[PDB]
Amino acid sequence: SAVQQKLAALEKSSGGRLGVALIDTADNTQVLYRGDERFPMCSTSKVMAAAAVLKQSETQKQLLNQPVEIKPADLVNYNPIAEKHVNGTMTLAELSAAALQYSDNTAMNKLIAQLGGPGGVTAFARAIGDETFRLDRTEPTLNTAIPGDPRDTTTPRAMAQTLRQLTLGHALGETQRAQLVTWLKGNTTGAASIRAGLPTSWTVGDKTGSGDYGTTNDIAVIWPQGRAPLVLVTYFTQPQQNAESRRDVLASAARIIAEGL
Incomplete structure (x- = not known):
């Protein structure tokens, strides 16, 4: 489709590897680009950890209010809160x-x-x-x-x-x-x-x-506003270990997807 040609062009322009999955809940239609390739999740994995704890709280009703001690040894590389x-x-x-x-x-x-x-x-x-x-x-x-x-x-x-x-x-x-x-x-x-x-x-x-x-x-x-919700996943990774982040690629992929709905 047009959208897959534009995503492929975006990927080619970026020098990296782009994965996209859109679900339109209006008709359960899906748009996929490298949809079945593996990508490193990095912090997107935090959604699964949080949801797993939420699932536990369905039975342990007070679980979310349980205090957890933060010790200096617990701190890793990025701990703003x-x-x-x-x-x-x-x-x-x-x-x-x-x-x-x-x-x-x-x-x-x-x-x-x-x-x-x-x-x-x-x-x-x-x-x-x-x-x-x-x-x-x-x-x-x-x-x-x-x-x-x-x-x-x-x-x-x-x-x-x-x-x-x-x-x-x-x-x-x-x-x-x-x-x-x-x-x-x-x-x-x-x-x-x-x-x-x-x-x-x-x-x-x-x-x-x-x-x-x-x-x-x-x-x-x-x-x-006035339209069924969408689920959009955009993964991007690059061949150089020290490559800089490319949030603009994700913005551009979203824009390409939004052109069409």
């Missing part, structure tokens, strides 16, 4: 918010620990029908994004389907789904990524990710 609470506590809700809206890496590691390790995050994916997602490592090493390495990867198609189920579907309880949506809508790191390619009037909830090999990712649920 956890740093503010060293030698104090954060609740699991606050850690989930921090992981999602500020991409706090300490917060992610606490979520992983709550789930019993990366295998606990992966198990949640399997439980909701995602056979592709795999989380293998903790922060910060899950962002190495080494070409060909299957650790800590998923495909665009799989992540779009899973994000749809978590936010618009019923993989989570009603209160949990609403909380996840609220968290995503409040993301602070996404202004230059998918959001930048979309009409300003559209409501977006997203989670970015970035890593080595110039890996630049964003996954979003999009609520256009």
